[PDB]
Write an enzyme that holds these catalytic residues in place. Structure first.
Site, PDB file in Angstrom:
ATOM      1  N   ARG A 143      12.553  -6.437   0.419  1.00  0.00           N
ATOM      2  CA  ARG A 143      11.284  -6.598   1.166  1.00  0.00           C
ATOM      3  C   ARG A 143      10.033  -6.565   0.298  1.00  0.00           C
ATOM      4  NH1 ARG A 143      13.142  -5.425   6.815  1.00  0.00           N
ATOM      5  NH2 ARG A 143      14.935  -4.164   6.556  1.00  0.00           N
ATOM      6  N   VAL A 144      10.158  -6.308  -1.001  1.00  0.00           N
ATOM      7  CA  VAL A 144       9.025  -6.349  -1.944  1.00  0.00           C
ATOM      8  C   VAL A 144       8.996  -7.704  -2.671  1.00  0.00           C
ATOM      9  CG1 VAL A 144       7.916  -5.172  -3.907  1.00  0.00           C
ATOM     10  CG2 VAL A 144       8.946  -3.825  -2.128  1.00  0.00           C
TER      11      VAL A 144
END
Ligand code: ATP
Ligand code: MG
Lengths: 340, 115, 52, 269, 52, 115, 86
Positions: free
Chosen positions: A205-206
């Protein structure tokens, strides 16, 4: 038995020169397994940079329940003082089983699989501490002794599933808390793809914000391209010969699939991973046989290490990329294939 | 999603897309065991359009640039309707399947096919 | 054409000798690198005087 | 995991069973189209055989080389119930026999599955045709047949045969080998010389026998495909039945486990 | 003759390449001896000191 | 089961056996509906070796003699690695599948095939 | 299960039929009214018999719609009628 501990221990070993402190928390493991992990950290030179917190299988369920929080507190010491740390929880599913025991013996009413009602909050209260704090937070915590520096605690929790069932209460909770997941598949592990990472189910998710300039550019779209290759390989398995667009995608996906294979206790630097990614995405592997991709990568790295050492040292300073480095890598790969 | 609230052109395009994707869901399992060549001339064509429609539903968002790498696309209601009607009527049967993956409006799909 | 074929055969023959020499030269250069890295590994393995 | 995954597998196998049941009737329909095409080509071949018999008996002045002392037919597609395998098994017996005699062998191929077999074992193919429709045309066979006729006129071949399946009945396809090249009170008004006529009619006769062998093999193929899709439909039924028993076990276990958790939670509260 | 000369050029390249692979494999085989003999000497000296 | 504990020859033989058995397990449903004849020329060869490996793993025990009558067999690690390595390399592709069932060492499979 | 056992009949709506453009989504193969023809006027009771037969024939022949060129004319007649009634 598919490499969950091997992935997290190799990630701890790779930090010995990164400036990141490490913490390994063993929950409900046998003491001889803990002693073997410590021997492997020491043989690879990583023990001097690691704190090992042990709550073995014979210890009180209270100590097994508290161990992740004790290890988290030891990691937070570095975060609050403008330093970086990494923590591994080898089994949060064993911490949940210890918490379920105490809760049932205290006579608290059970939930979805006899687990306490607050089993989600057990893991969410632990995992929200792993974070990056601003310069203002560090400056306030240290009373001005440390300035202009951020602090961080990175976490690598491990979870075990039964026959691939993710619908269980504890696995469902933890997948919904972390900033991403790495799914290991037994069918890929038995098929010899040993890091066994399912690229279709695994996600970060980064994304690109967590990568150096060179890896960010050379890896853009590889995850989704492999996810589409796995589907294409199954759809075109029994059909007659297809168009050039289909053959190009299939032949490339087979080469990247063979390239993603790596051995245990053998980490690669930014420059070594970069050469491997460049040779694949820039089309240099198109003439190479699938059964020779491993030999080609190992020889290419060994050649750049002897004849281009100053370029690898430049890529390894910060993982920077520009037309000079791009052309430098191109010239070296062309000379390699044309002469070795 | 009612003709009395929006219009018949929008509604027919939406139901048209749904019809094509619903029929493809039963053929997906057929192709995987007996192969594509055993389907009818109408089924083979429909499967190709369904796989293209399935890809033209994709769009890179401005908030997803950190995950996708490519820039973000905003598409309008009329542009959306026209693009899906074109694939349903057969105006793009000659374009390759990969040209509709991550490309905002219908024009960019015609351009991606050339790269 | 026969005279030119003998001159061409004379070039193809010597080019093959040169390439075969370079292929073995690069192999000997690779073998030397492997043994030197093994000497540094064996020298670093000496950590046991303190790590144990 | 549980009942949900099993229910999805049952629906998937059921969707496949519905088309293999339909494909059996489609194969029977195409079998009847092939059987009518087999009958339509017989009058021409029997009449050419009747002409060559008189035109050779009445003219002892000339003996054609074909009157004094392999072409393999195969399918282009899947779902064949042992059709091609039983034919190659029968051919290998005669090729081995020719090597006990010490003779050299020339091979000709019709269909994509025949070409793949010889390529996997190193067989020497002199000519090859493939990708023909389910209803073939005789003009496509001329090429492959001529190469084999020329090898006879050049003295390279002593005997030539056509290897194909014969339609015994709708439930029985027989693999066979048939010899091609080595075969009353009035006379004809031969317009050209009788030798010129005999040379052309013998060529038309051999091509017609190869075309009849190809059309009868296609009838055998549709009959083999009917049995294969019938077997696939029956095999899928056994898998569906076993999965339904496993599904019912998971259905009963889920209800028992939910009730145990509700009774356990209400005993504590 | 020129076709046989071309075949000879390819043959010596395949021979040289086969020997190049053997030269590198013998270097890998040698590296393991250098590393394991250092391990046994270092561990033996560690036991020598431990007993004392 | 680690290269640093058992050596590369044993480790690669064991990994080779697991790869063949895993690929054979993936084909089970296709083989059950359509039979072995529809598989590729590569899959057909792998399935034939998988069936031989699966049978060569069997062994008559000295405590199991009462159940059947057959004498027990003790097989060394050297003989075990040599047998499976040969089957993986294709050195026994010509012997029949039933010759590997209940025979101890690999040489006994060669003698059993003579009957 | 309780309510299906209490009622006189059931009208079953299906998601697969509704997504295939069959808007009322009524699965006529499993839906039933135990009262039946007693709840119909003379005209609807007379006309509905051939329609039930056509939908039953369509459910048995639906797999052949993709291969209709290879069907027997007598079977093709049932299939084409079943498609128009559906
Ligand atoms: N990259 C790799 N290459 C080859 N083998 C590997 C690799 N990674 C892991 N393995 C091997 O596979 C096994 C994985 O064991 P590991 O303990 O790491 O898995 P696990 O999921 O944590 O098992 P467990 O459930 O017992 O804790 C070990 O034998 C290990 O040596
Ligand atoms: Mg583990």
């Amino acid at each position: 038995q598919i490499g969950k501990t091997a992935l997290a221990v190799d990630a701890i070993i790779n930090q010995k020169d990164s400036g990141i402190k490490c913490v390994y928390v063993a929950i409900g493991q046998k003491q001889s397994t803990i002693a073997n992990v410590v021997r492997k950290l020491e043989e690879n030179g990583a023990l001097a940079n690691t704190i090992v917190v042990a709550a073995s299988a014979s210890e009180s369920a209270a100590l097994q329940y508290l161990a992740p929080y004790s290890g988290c507190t030891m990691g937070e010491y570095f975060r609050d003082r403008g330093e970086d740390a990494l923590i591994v929880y080898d089994d949060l599913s064993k911490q949940a089983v210890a918490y379920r025991q105490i809760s049932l013996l205290l006579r608290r009413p059970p939930g979805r699989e006899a687990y306490p009602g607050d089993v989600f909050y057990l893991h969410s209260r632990l995992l929200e501490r792993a974070s990056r704090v601003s310069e203002e937070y560090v400056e306030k915590f240290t009373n001005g002794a440390v300035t202009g520096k951020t602090g961080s605690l990175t976490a690598l929790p491990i979870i075990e599933t039964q026959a691939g069932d993710v619908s269980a209460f504890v696995p469902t909770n933890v997948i919904s808390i972390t900033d991403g997941q790495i799914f290991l598949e037994s069918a890929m592990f038995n098929s010899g793809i040993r890091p066994a990472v399912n690229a279709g189910i695994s996600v970060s998710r980064v994304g690109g914000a967590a990568q150096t300039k060179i890896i960010k550019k050379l890896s853009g779209g590889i995850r989704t391209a492999l996810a589409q290759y796995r589907e294409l390989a199954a759809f075109a398995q029994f059909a007659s010969d297809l168009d050039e667009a289909t053959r190009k995608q299939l032949e490339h996906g087979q080469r990247v699939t063979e390239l993603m294979k790596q051995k245990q206790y053998a980490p690669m630097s930014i420059a070594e991973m970069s050469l491997s990614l460049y040779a694949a995405e820039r089309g240099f592997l198109q003439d190479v046989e699938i059964a020779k991709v491993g030999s080609f990568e190992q020889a290419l790295i060994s050649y750049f290490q002897r004849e281009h050492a100053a370029l690898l040292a430049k890529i390894n300073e910060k993982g920077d990329f520009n037309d000079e480095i791009d052309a430098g890598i191109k010239a070296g790969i062309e000379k390699f294939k044309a002469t070795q | 999603l009612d003709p009395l609230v929006i219009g018949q052109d929008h509604y027919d395009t939406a139901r048209g897309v749904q019809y094509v994707l619903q029929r493809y869901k039963e053929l997906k399992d057929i192709i995987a065991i007996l192969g594509m060549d055993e389907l009818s001339e109408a089924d083979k064509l429909l499967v190709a359009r369904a796989r293209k429609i399935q890809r033209f539903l994709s769009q890179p968002f401005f908030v997803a640039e950190v995950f996708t790498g490519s820039p973000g696309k905003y598409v309008s209601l009329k542009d959306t309707i026209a693009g899906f009607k074109g694939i349903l009527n057969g105006d793009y049967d000659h374009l390759p399947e990969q040209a509709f993956y991550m490309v905002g409006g219908i024009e960019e799909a015609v351009e991606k096919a050339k790269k | 054409d026969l005279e030119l074929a003998h001159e061409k055969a004379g070039q193809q023959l010597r080019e093959a000798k040169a390439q075969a020499a370079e292929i073995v030269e690069q192999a000997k250069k690779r073998a030397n690198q492997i043994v030197d890295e093994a000497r540094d590994q064996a020298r670093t393995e000496g950590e046991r005087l303190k790590a144990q | 995991a549980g009942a949900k995954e099993i229910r999805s597998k049952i629906a998937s196998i059921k969707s496949t069973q519905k088309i293999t049941n339909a494909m059996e009737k489609v194969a029977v329909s195409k079998m009847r189209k092939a059987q009518m095409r087999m009958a339509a080509g017989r009058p021409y071949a029997e009449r050419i055989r009747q002409v060559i018999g008189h035109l050779a008996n009445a003219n002892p002045e000339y003996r054609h080389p074909f009157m004094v002392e392999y072409i393999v037919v195969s399918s282009d597609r899947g779902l064949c119930g042992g059709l091609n395998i039983n034919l190659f098994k029968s051919l290998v017996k005669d090729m081995s026999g020719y090597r006990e005699q010490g003779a050299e062998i020339d091979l000709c191929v019709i269909g994509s599955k025949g070409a793949s077999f010889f390529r996997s074992f190193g067989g020497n193919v002199v000519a090859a045709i493939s990708h023909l429709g389910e209803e073939p045309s005789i003009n496509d066979l001329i090429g492959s047949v001529k190469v084999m006729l020329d090898a006879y006129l050049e003295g390279r071949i002593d005997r030539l045969f056509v290897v194909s399946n014969k339609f015994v009945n709708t439930m029985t396809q027989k693999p066979t080998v048939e010899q091609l090249i080595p075969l009353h009170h009035w006379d004809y008004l031969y317009e050209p010389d009788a030798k010129s006529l005999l040379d052309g009619l013998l060529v038309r006769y051999v091509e017609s026998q190869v075309y009849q062998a190809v059309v009868e093999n296609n009838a055998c193929e549709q009959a083999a495909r009917m049995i294969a899709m019938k077997n696939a439909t029956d095999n899928a039924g056994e898998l569906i039945s076993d999965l339904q028993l496993i599904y019912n076990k998971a259905r009963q276990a889920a209800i028992t486990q939910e009730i145990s958790e509700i009774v356990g939670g209400a005993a504590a509260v």
